[PDB]
């Protein structure tokens, strides 16, 4: 574990992971009309609880 | 303008009504932004005084971060309370004066004739 001049390669992948997590968090925030839109509005399949998460 | 609001306590940072509001998360983007501002403050302090950066004043940097977060928590709580109060008084006024805010009833696009403006 000597002379870590290469740990900096984790910053941008970390940023990508974090951004994807934040977008996931946002579309969790906006889980309204999830199956109430006049276009799809399908009844839940027998093993289904949420339609698109 | 909300200073003359009834029951308004003078120089009370957080009245007891504000304890009914939900607090922040402590993971709020703005509190971590304030921690980031504190970290950059320590970094700038070291840069100005011809010191190393990200290496020198870890106790000072930690203190900056904690001071910024520990102030932002309570300031954000106060601001949440004030905006809550705004909505509260607005709702109360519309509910007391419905003649000025009538139950409007709008129309459809089949009954109204909006004018056509070609491009051509």
């Amino acid at each position: 574990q000597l002379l870590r001049e290469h740990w900096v390669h984790i910053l941008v992948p970390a940023g990508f992971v974090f951004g994807c997590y934040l977008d996931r968090k946002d579309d969790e925030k906006l889980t309204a009309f999830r199956n109430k839109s006049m276009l799809f509005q399908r009844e839940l399949r027998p093993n289904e609880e949420v339609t698109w998460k | 303008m909300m200073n003359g609001r009834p029951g308004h306590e003078p120089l009370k940072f957080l009245p007891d009504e504000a304890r009914s509001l939900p607090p922040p998360k402590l993971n709020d983007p703005r509190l971590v932004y304030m921690g980031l501002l504190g970290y950059c403050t320590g970094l700038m302090d070291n840069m100005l005084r011809m010191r190393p950066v990200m290496r020198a004043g870890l106790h000072r940097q930690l203190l900056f971060v904690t001071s910024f977060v520990f102030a932002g928590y309570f300031y954000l709580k106060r601001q949440n309370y004030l905006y809550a109060v705004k909505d509260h008084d607005m709702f109360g006024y519309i509910k007391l004066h419905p003649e000025d805010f009538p139950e409007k009833e709008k129309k459809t696009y089949a009954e109204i004739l909006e004018p056509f403006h070609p491009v051509r």
């Binding site: 900096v8 941008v12 990508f16 579309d27 | 403006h117």
Partner: protein, 459 residues
């Protein structure tokens, strides 16, 4: 989008915390990867556009500009690598930070839902550009250039803030989806014509119009290079995007408040290309060509037809790529002769027979070569203008003629002729500055192979 602009922020610690010897490499490679992950938002299998939050959205007009902004950064970063190589490491890293800030702010602009977000970011873009032009320009006119480039913009943009504030006080939201579905026809009064002008004469300055373009030559001529790349590639398009977004709330005033600007654009396009026919400075020739191109985009957006918006998008992207390419090609010689005067060195294609192909292709992009997204744009807006009025082709044809002329004259009096035998300092070539032109041209070929993407809101 957040997954695109958080890594872009992480590129800054990647600069500051890396070695002096392993900082250009890491940031360049990771910038290429940001460009790669900026292709997820081309997954539009539907007609409905892509809203990720109240903040961010992405339409088929946003996405090409987004991708091009994320893609230019490695090119700026490699082009900026010969000069400021003997600069101190902190100065290098400051340059890198300014370029990445430009990337981030411009992505945020093209992804914004509200107009105020777009405003504060459209104006925040001024600070990196001014710093780049002024601290790293080579000449002494860079200061006046920065002043011009800043204050034209601010003069145009303060009324824009006033008009947006008015629209918020009138409607309540200032969001673009809601202003689309809730737009009242305007009463056609002076109080609304001033609103039209306040909303438009910030973007029209930045595109630019011919009445007001003096900032663009003074800046292109004096910015080091990467500033010139950006100022030719997306800062001009940052006005066209805004016009295309804001014009929806100005109907029917665009039917009669547009005559002066269409007319100025057309005549001044002819004027600018005639200037390009006769100009001692190569970096000014590219700039006046950019004016003569963006004028068509002005007229096209003013006409507000589908063909016209389409061709505007096509011309936007094509012009950005090919103009950045031409600025790189001129910088390639300026890094040796240290002179912008074109007739100085005029007999190349002996020493640089491969760069002289990139030159040729860059010019053929510039003039109307048909299998190219340049001619598609120019042709479709010509067709829109002919529908508008048949007497505009008389001007577009003069432009086409002069635009063949100045481009081929550039090629000839720079490459063809007898070599300037008194130039021992013509070093062979850089693999770096060959890869630059390859990365500018390969996208043009790909987008020509598939222009279904490069269209806009209307197709």
């Amino acid at each position: 989008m957040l997954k695109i602009i958080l890594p872009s922020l992480m590129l800054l610690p990647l600069t500051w915390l890396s070695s002096p010897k392993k900082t250009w490499t890491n940031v360049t490679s990771y910038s290429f990867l940001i460009s790669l992950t900026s292709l997820t938002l081309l997954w539009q299998t539907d007609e409905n556009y892509k809203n990720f939050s109240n903040m961010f959205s992405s339409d088929p007009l946003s996405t090409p500009l987004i991708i091009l902004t994320a893609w230019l950064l490695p090119l700026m970063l490699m082009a900026s690598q010969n000069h400021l190589k003997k600069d101190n490491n902190v100065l290098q890293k400051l340059y890198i930070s300014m370029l990445i800030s430009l990337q981030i702010l411009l992505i945020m602009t093209f992804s914004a839902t509200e107009l105020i977000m777009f405003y504060i970011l459209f104006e925040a873009t001024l600070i990196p550009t001014l710093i780049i032009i002024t601290r790293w320009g080579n000449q002494t006119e860079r200061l006046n250039a920065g002043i011009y480039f800043l204050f034209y913009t601010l003069i145009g943009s303060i009324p824009l803030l006033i008009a947006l504030i008015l629209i918020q006080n009138h409607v309540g939201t200032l969001n673009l989806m809601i202003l689309s579905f809730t737009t009242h026809t305007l009463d056609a009064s002076w109080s609304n014509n001033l609103l039209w002008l306040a909303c438009m004469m910030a973007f029209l300055i930045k595109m630019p119009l011919y009445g007001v373009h003096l900032w663009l030559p003074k800046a292109h001529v004096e910015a080091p290079i990467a500033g010139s790349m950006i100022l030719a590639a997306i800062l001009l398009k940052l006005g066209s995007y805004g016009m295309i977004r804001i014009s929806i709330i100005l109907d029917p005033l665009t039917k009669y408040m547009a005559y002066p600007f269409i007319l100025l654009s057309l005549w001044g396009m002819i004027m600018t290309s005639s200037i390009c026919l006769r100009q001692t400075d190569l970096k000014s020739l590219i700039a006046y060509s950019s004016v003569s191109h963006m004028a068509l985009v002005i007229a096209s957006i003013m006409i507000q037809t589908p063909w016209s918006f389409m061709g505007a998008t096509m011309l936007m992207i094509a012009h950005g790529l090919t103009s950045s390419l031409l600025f790189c090609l001129a910088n390639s010689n300026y890094e040796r002769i240290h002179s912008r005067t074109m007739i100085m060195a005029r007999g190349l294609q002996m020493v640089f027979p491969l760069m002289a192909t990139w030159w040729l292709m860059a010019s053929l992009a510039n003039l109307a070569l048909p299998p190219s997204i340049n001619l598609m744009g120019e042709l479709f807006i010509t067709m829109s203008l002919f529908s508008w009025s048949n007497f505009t082709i008389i001007l577009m044809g003069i432009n086409i003629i002069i635009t063949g002329m100045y481009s081929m004259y550039m090629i000839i009096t720079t490459q063809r002729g007898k070599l300037t035998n008194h130039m021992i300092n013509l070093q062979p070539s850089h693999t770096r500055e060959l890869t630059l032109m390859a990365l500018h041209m390969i996208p043009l070929i790909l987008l020509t192979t598939s222009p279904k993407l490069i269209t806009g809101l209307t197709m």
